A paper describes a structure:
Considering the inherent difficulty in obtaining MbtI–Mg2+ cocrystals and the results of our biochemical assays, we hypothesized that we could compensate for the rather low affinity of MbtI for its cofactor by using saturating concentrations of Mg2+. Interestingly, 2.1 Å resolution data were collected from a non-isomorphous crystal grown under these conditions. In chain A, the Mg2+ interacts with the oxygen of Gly421, with four ordered water molecules, and with a sulfate anion. The coordination pattern of Mg2+ in chains B and D is analogous: the ion could be modeled as directly interacting with Glu297, Glu434, and two ordered water molecules, which in turn make H-bonds to Glu294 and Glu431. The salicylate coordinates the Mg2+ ion with its carboxylic moiety, which also forms additional H-bonds with the peptide backbone through Gly270 and Gly421 and with the side chain of Thr271. As previously noted, the bond between the carboxylic function and Gly270–Thr271 is responsible for the adoption of the closed conformation. The presence of bound salicylate in the structure is remarkable, especially considering that the natural substrate was not added to the crystallization solution. Unsurprisingly, the position that was occupied by the pyruvate is here taken by a sulfate ion, provided in the crystallization solution as the Mg2+ counterion. Observing such a conformation in this ternary complex is not surprising when high concentrations of Mg2+ are present; consistent with previous hypothesis and biochemical data, the bound Mg2+ ion stabilizes the enzyme in a close conformation, which in turn prevents the loss of salicylate from the active site.
The salicylate synthase MbtI from Mycobacterium tuberculosis (Mtb, the etiological agent of TB) is the first enzyme involved in the biosynthesis of mycobactins. These small-molecule siderophores are capable of chelating iron, a key cofactor involved in several mycobacterium-specific biological processes. MbtI has been structurally and biochemically characterized;2 it is essential for the survival of Mtb under iron-deficient conditions, and, as such, it has been identified as a promising therapeutic target. MbtI belongs to the group of structurally homologous Mg2+-dependent menaquinone, siderophore, and tryptophan (MST) enzymes, which transform chorismate by rearrangement, to generate precursor molecules for the respective biosynthetic pathways.
Residue numbers in the entry: 5 to 449
The structure:
């Protein structure tokens, strides 16, 4: 599972009691374990394992202008040039010499350097934050595994197993029908650029301000019982709080060399009744426009994966099937390959980042159009939440279907892939469908 190879603990597992849900226990642990000590954390769900990385032992901060390594209140600064993946990889490999796993996030802006667009970034633009935790607690349906977990973490687990998790309170509604960023006018500009032949597709997005503060662990729990994401996360790291139900896996690199990527394209609503959802499912599977965009994205994923894979190892093992993602359903393909000996996990991330779902087609022209037609910098939105291991593992989830809090600002953000035949009204409605992954499940603070 996640706990394989170098990711190991000699500690005995605690068996999971019968009616206890792992997402609820892990999110409650994140709230309790860090409230009493005011410490940062990242909860990452990966293949049935909810990994709670609690406390910051060491932090790697990659900005557009410098790289910092912070440990025990001491900051080491350094200038960097060239690929941001090479700079981040070198600093994170040093963290992983002392600990078996590292966690964090990668901003959308991390992906602009491969296209020669980094000079458009403002000074001190955040690119990545990756830390090694003080403690890890892995929760699954079967058991709870502890990695360097003290008496305090054990007492917290024991109290939650004895009393049970908190009841999730009532949710508070938010209106997403307003368009203060002029998303529909920005879509019409992109449609005219595509008609003029500048590019084939660009992903544009809009922010939705939440007019009240939310409780991130309780909102995470409520939304997770109504969603089926590929990965999910809940974090409090520095100045940002975030939660999300990642619909798409940018890349998974295992220590045994297997590389996985799972591109998505096309969207229909889900959760509106069985017969209506099955009409939308049949429409999505047979719709010419959605099929063309899905095949063009698979062709792009195969090109990027071929650059970092052993020759003849790239393979589509699941092609163009409907993937259900709570309030929406999409076309998805699963691509598998073997990491070439001349390549590494950071090079694999750099080849597959940004996702087509975050940029466009061709990816270089989509990223350039996003600088002009979307609210920049995007930050965490359309970037990735990552988990790395000492033996070469990397798991990167696309940061979509997420909520954020920085300062007093709480917001949601959703986008749509705009093509030549796009109608601004249908693209706006598609952002509402994607926003419905979280809007009925916001628990106020
Ligand atoms: Mg190539
Ligand atoms: Mg589209």
């Amino acid at each position: 599972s996640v706990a394989t190879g170098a990711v190991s603990t000699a500690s005995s597992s605690i068996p999971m009691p019968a009616g206890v849900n792992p997402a609820d226990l892990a999110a409650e642990l994140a709230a309790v374990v860090t409230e009493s000590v005011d410490e940062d954390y990242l909860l990452y769900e990966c293949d049935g394992q909810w990994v709670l990385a609690a406390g910051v032992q060491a932090m790697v901060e990659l900005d557009s202008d410098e790289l910092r390594v912070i440990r025990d209140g001491v900051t080491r600064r350094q200038q960097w040039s060239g690929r941001p993946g090479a700079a981040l990889g070198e600093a994170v490999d040093r963290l992983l010499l002392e600990t078996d796993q590292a966690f964090g996030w990668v901003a959308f802006e991390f992906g602009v350097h491969r296209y020669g667009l980094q000079q458009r970034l403002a000074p001190h633009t955040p690119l990545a934050r990756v830390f090694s935790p003080r403690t890890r607690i892995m929760v699954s349906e079967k058991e709870i595994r502890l990695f360097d977990a003290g008496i305090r973490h054990r007492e917290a687990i024991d109290r939650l197993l004895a009393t049970g998790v908190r009841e999730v309170p009532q949710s508070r509604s938010v209106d997403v029908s307003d368009d203060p960023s002029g998303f529909r006018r920005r879509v019409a500009v992109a449609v005219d650029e595509i008609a003029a032949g500048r590019y084939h597709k660009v992903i544009l997005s809009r922010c939705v301000e939440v007019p009240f503060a939310i409780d991130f662990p309780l909102t995470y729990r409520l939304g997770r019982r109504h969603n089926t994401p590929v990965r999910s996360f809940l974090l409090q790291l520095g100045g940002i709080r975030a939660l999300g139900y990642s619909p798409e896996l940018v890349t998974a690199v295992r220590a045994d060399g297997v590389v996985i990527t799972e591109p998505l394209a096309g969207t229909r609503a889900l959760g509106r009744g069985p017969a209506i959802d099955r009409l939308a499912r049949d429409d999505l599977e047979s719709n010419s426009k959605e099929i063309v965009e899905h095949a063009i994205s698979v062709r792009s994923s195969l090109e990027e994966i071929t650059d970092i894979a052993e020759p003849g190892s790239a393979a589509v093992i699941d092609f163009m099937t409907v993937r259900e993602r709570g309030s929406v359903q999409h076309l998805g393909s699963t691509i598998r390959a073997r990491l070439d000996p001349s390549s590494d996990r950071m090079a694999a991330l750099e080849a597959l980042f940004p996702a087509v779902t975050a940029s466009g087609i061709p990816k270089a022209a989509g990223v350039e159009a996003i600088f002009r037609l979307d609210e920049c910098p995007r930050g965490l939105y359309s970037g990735a939440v990552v988990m790395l291991s000492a033996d070469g593992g990397l798991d990167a989830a696309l940061t979509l279907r997420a909520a954020y809090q920085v300062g007093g600002r709480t917001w949601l953000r959703a986008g749509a892939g705009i093509i030549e035949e796009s109608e601004p009204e249908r693209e706006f409605e598609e952002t509402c469908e994607k926003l419905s992954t979280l809007t009925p499940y916001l628990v106020a603070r």
